[PDB]
From Swiss-Prot:
It comes from the Bacteria. Belongs to the protein kinase superfamily. Ser/Thr protein kinase family. It is found in: Secreted. Disulfide bonds: none annotated. Acts as a virulence determinant. This is Protein kinase YpkA.
Length: 270
């Protein structure tokens, strides 16, 4: 597990490279090799450190790539480019979820930078350099494509979330209130059949029946709601997404789903 300590240590490395760049002493193989380690770390960290500190670290990384670009505006292949390329190439054979988008975005920026550095460094260009530039570019663009597909799927998922939440307005407040009243006034369930609990058990049935009539006109909608909402919730997951609009919407959808499912189950029980 990535610790606050290790995150600080990685940030100290970035700051060292940044101060180096300011004195025109940037160790290019060093900053690139260190950046790669940080991509692996941040991928992990995000999945499980103050989110505060995680945001600052993503931004320090962006500052560092910015400095690399300015540095180049104004063996390496074998030991620096090649291992990073090979690691990222592994993403291109993996099944992705929405939670991967951030890390694929970062990996793409990383390949772009490797390419930029290699181009500048070689422009006397060898056949071998051209072959590596090809491989790097084919990887980068394959990643771009897989990433675009994933982002489009996410756009569609967010659109469906909005539509579901918006359509739910026809039943949601009345169903929530009706379920609240159920839960607030619910008699104890009795497990026996003794005559002395017959009144309690008739109370159970009568109380259920009030709630079922309040939501009787919504039962189809709530059932069709959950057919759509459950798979979408699984696709959206439970991790921090700080598109904090998205996390708010997601948890609205989850609440609406529990209401619908409770009321769907209650109707089948009675």
């Amino acid at each position: 597990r990535i610790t606050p300590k290790k995150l600080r240590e990685l940030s100290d490395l970035l700051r060292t490279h940044l101060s180096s760049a300011a004195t025109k002493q940037l160790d290019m193989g060093g900053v690139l090799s260190d950046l790669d380690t940080m991509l692996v770390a941040l991928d992990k960290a995000e999945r499980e450190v103050d989110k505060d500190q995680l945001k600052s670290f993503n931004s320090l990384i962006l500052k560092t790539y910015r400095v690399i670009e300015d540095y180049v505006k104004g063996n390496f292949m074998l030991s620096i480019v090649e291992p990073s390329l090979q690691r990222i190439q592994k993403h291109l054979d993996q099944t992705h979820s929405f939670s991967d988008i951030g890390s694929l975005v970062r990996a793409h920026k990383h390949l772009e930078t490797l390419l930029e550095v290699l181009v500048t460094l070689s422009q006397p260009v060898s056949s071998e350099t051209y072959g590596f530039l090809n491989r790097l570019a084919e990887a980068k663009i394959t990643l771009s494509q897989q990433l675009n597909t994933l982002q489009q799927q996410q756009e569609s998922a967010k659109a469906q979330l909005s539509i579901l939440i918006n359509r739910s307005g026809s039943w949601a407040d009345v169903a929530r209130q009706s379920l609240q009243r159920f839960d607030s006034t619910r008699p104890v369930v009795k497990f026996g059949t003794e005559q002395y609990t017959a009144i309690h058990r008739q109370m159970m049935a009568a109380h259920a029946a009030i709630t079922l009539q309040e939501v009787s006109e919504f039962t189809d909608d709530m059932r069709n709601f959950t057919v759509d909402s459950i798979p979408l919730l699984i696709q959206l997951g439970r991790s921090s997404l700080m598109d904090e609009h998205l996390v708010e919407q997601r948890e609205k959808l989850r609440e609406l789903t529990t209401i619908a499912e409770r009321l769907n189950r209650l109707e089948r029980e009675w």
